[PDB]
Amino acid sequence: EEDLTEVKKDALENLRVYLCEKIIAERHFDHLRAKKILSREDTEEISCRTSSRKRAGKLLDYLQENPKGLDTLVESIRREKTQNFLIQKITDEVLKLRNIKLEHLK
Amino acid sequence: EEDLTEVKKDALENLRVYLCEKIIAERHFDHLRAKKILSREDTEEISCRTSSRKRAGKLLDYLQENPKGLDTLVESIRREKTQNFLIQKITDEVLKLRNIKLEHLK
Amino acid sequence: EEDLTEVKKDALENLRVYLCEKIIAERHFDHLRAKKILSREDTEEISCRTSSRKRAGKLLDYLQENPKGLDTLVESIRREKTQNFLIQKITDEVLKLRNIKLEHLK
Amino acid sequence: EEDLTEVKKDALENLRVYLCEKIIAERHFDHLRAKKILSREDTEEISCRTSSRKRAGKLLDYLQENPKGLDTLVESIRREKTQNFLIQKITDEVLKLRNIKLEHLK
Amino acid sequence: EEDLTEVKKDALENLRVYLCEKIIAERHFDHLRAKKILSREDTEEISCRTSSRKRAGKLLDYLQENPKGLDTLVESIRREKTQNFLIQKITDEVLKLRNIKLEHLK
Amino acid sequence: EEDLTEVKKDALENLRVYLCEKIIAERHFDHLRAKKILSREDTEEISCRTSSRKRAGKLLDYLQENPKGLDTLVESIRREKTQNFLIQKITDEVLKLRNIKLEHLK
Amino acid sequence: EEDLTEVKKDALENLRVYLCEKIIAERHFDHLRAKKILSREDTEEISCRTSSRKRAGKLLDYLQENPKGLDTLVESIRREKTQNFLIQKITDEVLKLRNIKLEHLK
Amino acid sequence: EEDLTEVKKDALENLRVYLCEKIIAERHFDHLRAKKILSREDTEEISCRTSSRKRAGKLLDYLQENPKGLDTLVESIRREKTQNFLIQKITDEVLKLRNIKLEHLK
Positive or negative, the Cα torsion across C47, C51, C56, C58? negative
Which residues does chain C have within 8 Å of residue D95's beta carbon, measured at their own beta carbons?
A: none
| Angle between helices A54-62 and A41-48 in degrees, nearest 10 | 150
Contact between H11 and H100 (Cβ < 8 Å): yes
DSSP D26: I
Name the neighbours of A, counting chains with at least 3 Cβ pairs within 8 A: B, C, D, E, F
Positive or negative, the Cα torsion across A37, A41, A44, A49? negative
Range of the structural domain that residue D45 is part of = 1-106
Chains B and H touch (3+ CB pairs under 8 A): no
Between the two ends of chain G, the Cα-to-Cα distance in Å is 15
Distance of CA C41 to the CA centre of its chain: 19
Which residues does chain H have within 8 Å of residue D32's beta carbon, measured at their own beta carbons?
A: 16-17, 19, 53, 57
Which residues does chain E have within 8 Å of residue F31's beta carbon, measured at their own beta carbons?
A: 57
Q: Which of G20, G24, G82 has its CB closest to that of H37?
A: G82
Q: What is the dihedral of CA H30, H32, H38, H42, to 10 degrees?
A: 90
Rounded to whole angstroms, how far apart are CA atoms A78 and D2? 62
Inter-chain CB proximity A35 and C19 less than 8 Å: no
Closest B-chain CA to A20: B32
Rounded to whole angstroms, how far apart are CA atoms F96 and F8? 8
The closest of F73, F59, F68 to F23, measured between CA atoms, is F59
Name the neighbours of H, counting chains with at least 3 Cβ pairs within 8 A: C, D, F, G
Contact between H60 and H19 (Cβ < 8 Å): yes
Q: What share of chain B is helix, strand, coil (3-state, %, to 5)?
A: 60, 0, 40
Q: How far is A10 from chain B (nearest CA, A)?
A: 9
Task: Count the alpha carbons within 13 Å of E45 in the hemisphere toward its beta carbon.
Answer: 16
Backbone φ and ψ of E83, nearest 5°: -120, 15
Q: Using alpha carbons only, what angle is made at residue E69 by residues F71 and A26, rounded to the nearest 5 degrees?
A: 85
Closest C-chain CA to E43: C51
Contact between E56 and E50 (Cβ < 8 Å): yes
Name the neighbours of D, counting chains with at least 3 Cβ pairs within 8 A: A, C, G, H
Q: How far is A14 from chain C (nearest CA, A)?
A: 30
Phi-psi region of B79 (alpha: psi -120 to 50; beta: other; left: phi over 0): left
Which residues does chain E have within 8 Å of residue A81's beta carbon, measured at their own beta carbons?
A: 39-40
Rounded to whole angstroms, how far apart are CA atoms H23 and H14? 15
Q: How far is D102 from chain H (nearest CA, A)?
A: 34
Query: How many residues can be counted in chain D?
Result: 106
Instruction: Calculate Rg over the CA atoms of chain B.
Output: 14
The closest of E83, E90, E74, E88 to E30, measured between CA atoms, is E74
Contact between F62 and F12 (Cβ < 8 Å): no
Inter-chain CB proximity D48 and G51 less than 8 Å: yes
Give Cβ neighbours of residue D87 (< 8 Å, ≥ 6 apart). D76, D77
| Widest pairwise Cα distance in chain E | 43
Amino acid identity of C84?
A: N
Please return the burial class of D86, using the count of CB atoms within 10 Å of its CB with bins 0-12, 13-18 and 19+: buried
Rounded to whole angstroms, how far apart are CA atoms E5 and C70? 51
Contact between A3 and A100 (Cβ < 8 Å): no
| Widest pairwise Cα distance in chain D | 43
Please return the burial class of B77, using the count of CB atoms within 10 Å of its CB with bins 0-12, 13-18 and 19+: middle
Interface with chain H: mutation pick from C39, C42, C45, highest number of H CBs within 10 Å = C45
Closest B-chain CA to G45: B51
Inter-chain CB proximity A20 and E66 less than 8 Å: no
Q: Which residues of G27-44 are buried (b: 16+ CB within 10 A; e: fewer)?
A: bbbbbbbbbeebeeeebe
Rounded to whole angstroms, how far apart are CA atoms D38 and D35? 4
Q: How far is C14 from chain A (nearest CA, A)?
A: 7
Closest C-chain CA to D80: C37
Which residues does chain F have within 8 Å of residue B76's beta carbon, measured at their own beta carbons?
A: none
DSSP B25: G
DSSP A84: S
Amino acid identity of B3?
A: D
Chains F and H touch (3+ CB pairs under 8 A): yes
Closest C-chain CA to E49: C49
Which residues does chain D have within 8 Å of residue C39's beta carbon, measured at their own beta carbons?
A: 28, 81
Rounded to whole angstroms, how far apart are CA atoms H70 and H5? 10
Closest B-chain CA to E7: B80
Rounded to whole angstroms, how far apart are CA atoms F84 and F25? 14
Rounded to whole angstroms, how far apart are CA atoms G3 and D30? 51
DSSP G46-100: HHHT-SSSHHHHHHHHHTTTSS---HHHHHHHSSSS-SSTTHHHHHHHHHHHHHH
Give Cβ neighbours of residue B32 (< 8 Å, ≥ 6 apart). A16, A17, A19, A53, A57
User: What number of C-beta contacts closer than 8 Å exist between B and E?
Assistant: 3
Provide the 10 A C-beta neighbour count for residue C16: 20
Closest F-chain CA to B28: F41
What is the SS3 assignment for H24? coil
Inter-chain CB proximity C13 and A32 less than 8 Å: no
Stretch (H or E) spanning A104: helix A87-105
Rounded to whole angstroms, how far apart are CA atoms C38 and C54? 17
Inter-chain CB proximity C57 and A32 less than 8 Å: yes
Give Cβ neighbours of residue E25 (< 8 Å, ≥ 6 apart). E76, E81
Q: How far is H28 from chain F (nearest CA, A)?
A: 21
Which residues does chain D have within 8 Å of residue A45's beta carbon, measured at their own beta carbons?
A: 50-51, 53
Name the neighbours of F, counting chains with at least 3 Cβ pairs within 8 A: A, B, E, G, H
Which residues does chain E have within 8 Å of residue C52's beta carbon, measured at their own beta carbons?
A: 41, 44
Distance of CA B16 to the CA centre of its chain: 9
Inter-chain CB proximity F67 and B82 less than 8 Å: no
Give Cβ neighbours of residue C57 (< 8 Å, ≥ 6 apart). A31, A32, C16, C19
Give Cβ neighbours of residue D41 (< 8 Å, ≥ 6 apart). G51, G52, G53
Name the neighbours of C, counting chains with at least 3 Cβ pairs within 8 A: A, D, E, H
Q: What is the dihedral of CA E85, E88, E93, E99, to 10 degrees?
A: -150
Interface with chain G: mutation pick from H40, H46, H48, H63, highest number of G CBs within 10 Å = H40
Give Cβ neighbours of residue E91 (< 8 Å, ≥ 6 apart). none
Which residues does chain G have within 8 Å of residue H39's beta carbon, measured at their own beta carbons?
A: 28, 81
The closest of D1, D25, D8 to D68, measured between CA atoms, is D8
The closest of G83, G95, G75 to G11, measured between CA atoms, is G95
Rounded to whole angstroms, how far apart are CA atoms G64 and G84? 24
Inter-chain CB proximity H40 and G28 less than 8 Å: yes
User: What number of C-beta contacts closer than 8 Å exist between F and G?
Assistant: 14
Positive or negative, the Cα torsion across D43, D46, D49, D54? negative
Which residues does chain H have within 8 Å of residue D33's beta carbon, measured at their own beta carbons?
A: 16-17
Chains B and A touch (3+ CB pairs under 8 A): yes
3-class SS letters over chain F: CCCHHHHHHHHHHHHCCCCCCCCCHHHHHHHHHHCCCCCCHHHHHHHHCCCCCHHHHHHHHHHHHCCCCCHHHHHHHCCCCCCCCCHHHHHHHHHHHHHHHHHHHC
Q: Using alpha carbons only, what angle is made at residue A75 by residues A72 and A78, rounded to the nearest 5 degrees?
A: 155
Which residues does chain E have within 8 Å of residue F35's beta carbon, measured at their own beta carbons?
A: 13, 16
Rounded to whole angstroms, how far apart are CA atoms C38 and C17? 22
Name the neighbours of E, counting chains with at least 3 Cβ pairs within 8 A: A, B, C, F
DSSP C3-34: -HHHHHHHHHHHHTT--SSS-THIIIIIHHHH
DSSP C88: H
Contact between B51 and G42 (Cβ < 8 Å): yes
Stretch (H or E) spanning B93: helix B87-105
Q: Which of H40, H45, H68 has its CB closest to that of G81?
A: H40
Inter-chain CB proximity H17 and D36 less than 8 Å: yes
Rounded to whole angstroms, how far apart are CA atoms B105 and B101? 7
Contact between G60 and G14 (Cβ < 8 Å): no
Q: How far is A44 from chain C (nearest CA, A)?
A: 11
Contact between G8 and G69 (Cβ < 8 Å): yes
Inter-chain CB proximity F32 and E17 less than 8 Å: yes
Please return the burial class of C35, using the count of CB atoms within 10 Å of its CB with bins 0-12, 13-18 and 19+: exposed
Which residues does chain B have within 8 Å of residue E9's beta carbon, measured at their own beta carbons?
A: 80
DSSP H18: -
Give Cβ neighbours of residue B91 (< 8 Å, ≥ 6 apart). none
Q: What is the resolution of this structure in A?
A: 4.0
Rounded to whole angstroms, how far apart are CA atoms C46 and C58? 7
Rounded to whole angstroms, how far apart are CA atoms D64 and H55? 29
Backbone φ and ψ of G103, nearest 5°: -55, -45
Interface with chain B: mutation pick from F5, F41, F49, highest number of B CBs within 10 Å = F41
The closest of E38, E59, E2 to A83, measured between CA atoms, is E38
Which residues does chain B have within 8 Å of residue E10's beta carbon, measured at their own beta carbons?
A: 80
Rounded to whole angstroms, how far apart are CA atoms H26 and H52? 8
Phi-psi region of G38 (alpha: psi -120 to 50; beta: other; left: phi over 0): beta
> Per the structure, how many domains does chain C have?
1
Interface with chain A: mutation pick from E37, E43, E45, E58, highest number of A CBs within 10 Å = E37
**Alpha helices per DSSP H over chain H:** 4-15, 25-28, 30-34, 41-48, 54-63, 71-77, 87-105
